[PDB]
Amino acid sequence: INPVNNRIQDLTERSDVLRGYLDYDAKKERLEEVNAELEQPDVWNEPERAQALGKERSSLEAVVDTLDQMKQGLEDVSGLLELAVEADDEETFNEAVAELDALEEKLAQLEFRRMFSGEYDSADCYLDIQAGSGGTEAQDWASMLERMYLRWAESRGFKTEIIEESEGEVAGIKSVTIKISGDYAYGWLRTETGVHRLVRKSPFDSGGRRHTSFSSAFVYPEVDDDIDIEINPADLRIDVYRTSESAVRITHIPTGIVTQCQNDRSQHKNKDQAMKQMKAKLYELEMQKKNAEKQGSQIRSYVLDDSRIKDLRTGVETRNTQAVLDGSLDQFIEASLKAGL
Amino acid sequence: QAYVKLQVAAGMANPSPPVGPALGQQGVNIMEFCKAFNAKTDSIEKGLPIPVVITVYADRSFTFVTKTPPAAVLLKKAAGIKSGSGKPNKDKVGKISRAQLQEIAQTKAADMTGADIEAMTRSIEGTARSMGLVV
Amino acid sequence: AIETLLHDPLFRQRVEKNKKGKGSYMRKGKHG
């Protein structure tokens, strides 16, 4: 029974948290005005507007209505439990124990929905880790980052694959494209776009000086065969180069951004892949622009000397640096998601 | 004379956001209809929707006779499911027994314009199938 | 424009000046 007891309160707490996150009062207010408008018969004369209003209302009701249900459902559960306690009957107790699960599940689902607001969160994505300016150290850092990300993916249950890798002459990697694959990958990883500041004492340096390196990650979802926009054949440049004949680089002239592929064996396959990547990138850029219209790049700082990692924007610190490196970065990502940046 | 069935759950008194102008399009007031609905409810269980005849006379005093609860909701209730099915032939969400369906059928008989309950049962079965539940 | 962003001086590899080692020597301390 102790676990059951624990579950009643915990669920309630999480519901409360969810409500807080929502900032439900505003939503309620919106619903109210909207409801009033709907009630007025002159709104339906203009059809499109009316439709829009209707659309607005229902969601508002439903989020709020869901919350209400949770509040009420929880209460009911509590009452049931109390009843069971009072009247020493097994069946009632069992019922009390059980009924709560469903509510919890519902709550979880709601939370998930809230989290993944964007349209392309569900789809798989292309992580892209490019090393810093510095030199060898930067490359090393990039490599480390890549390793971390792959481990994270593995932990999740994601199918990783290296689309492109460019190696650093001494050590590490100059740059690397990685295709992750699985359910809602982009929804997690889209937050982790940006620059990552490594700060450590350089083993590649002869002296024991403390170096500060950077590396960008850039994440974009796979949008092939669904999206209507296509690259203009004149703006698209194809280019071939040697593996490390097979590989293919693509270039776009107006925006001035490139994408490549070397994983496939023949040229044709590679080119197609590149095209796919490029279009996705374009889509991402367009959406970003849109967002901006509607409306520094460093996201995390890994300080390995003092042994603290601190996501900058969210403001969450952890000292288990090694763990984080090994792919225990879920915590940061979820925080980021919650924040809604 | 302006007769249409268009409403939600019986327990929700004065459903203005679901229905709104549809009930109060004609000269009859929004208060009255809701009140009537409430009155009707006291003899039966809350939670479920209920349709009713809306013969809107010129005197602003309407006659009304309730019908049986919605076919769908009743069907659902014996099944024990909230969401029915999305893409039912590809994968099955649930399933129903015929006896239960038959039982369900018999209780509606007053509103059902038909002598044979067998027919009703088969209709119910068909409906269930459509929804996405192989009998 | 990610490569250009990485290029900016903002993100150039800093190296912390020594206090006891090679570049140790300060002619004048932070305070007298």
Summarize the structure in words.
- Chain A: GO terms for molecular function: translation release factor activity, codon specific.
- The structure is cut from a larger assembly and holds chains A (341 residues), B (135 residues) and C (32 residues).
- Chain A is 50% helix and 22% strand.
- Chain A has nine helices and eleven strands.
- By secondary structure, chain A is an alpha+beta fold.
- Chain B folds into two domains: 3-67, 2-Layer Sandwich (Ribosomal protein L11, N-terminal domain); 68-135, Arc Repressor Mutant, subunit A (Orthogonal Bundle).
- In chain B, helix 3 crosses helix 4.
- The radius of gyration of chain B is 17 Å and the shape is elongated.
- Chain B contains four helices and no strands.
- Chain B is mostly helical.
- The chains are: A alpha+beta (341), B mainly alpha (135), C alpha+beta (32).
- Chains in contact: A-B, A-C.
- The interface between A and C is medium-sized, with 24 and 16 residues.
Based on the model shown, name its key terms.
part of a larger assembly; 3 chains; A: 341 residues; alpha+beta; 9 helices; 11 strands; C: 32 residues; 1 helix; elongated; Alternative ribosome-rescue factor A (chain C)
Strand content of chain B: under 5%
Provide a count of the helices of chain B.
4
Percent strand of chain A: 15-25%
- Which two protein chains have the largest interface (Cβ within 8 Å of the partner's Cβ), and how many residues from each? A-C, 24 and 16 residues
What about the largest sheet of chain A? 8 strands, mixed
Give the fraction of residues assigned to helices of chain B. Answer: 25-40%
Q: Judging from the principal axes of the Cα atoms, what is the shape of chain A?
A: globular
Number of strands of chain B: 0
**Adjacency order of strands in the biggest sheet of chain A:** 2-3-1-5-4-9-10-11
User: How many β-strand runs of chain A?
Assistant: 11
Determine the fraction of residues in helical runs of chain A and give it as a percent range. Answer: 40-55%
* Structure classification of chain B: mainly alpha
Report the total helices of chain A.
Answer: 9
Family (chain A): Belongs to the prokaryotic/mitochondrial release factor family.
Subcellular location (chain A): Cytoplasm
Organism (chain A): Escherichia coli (strain K12)
Protein name (chain A): Peptide chain release factor RF2
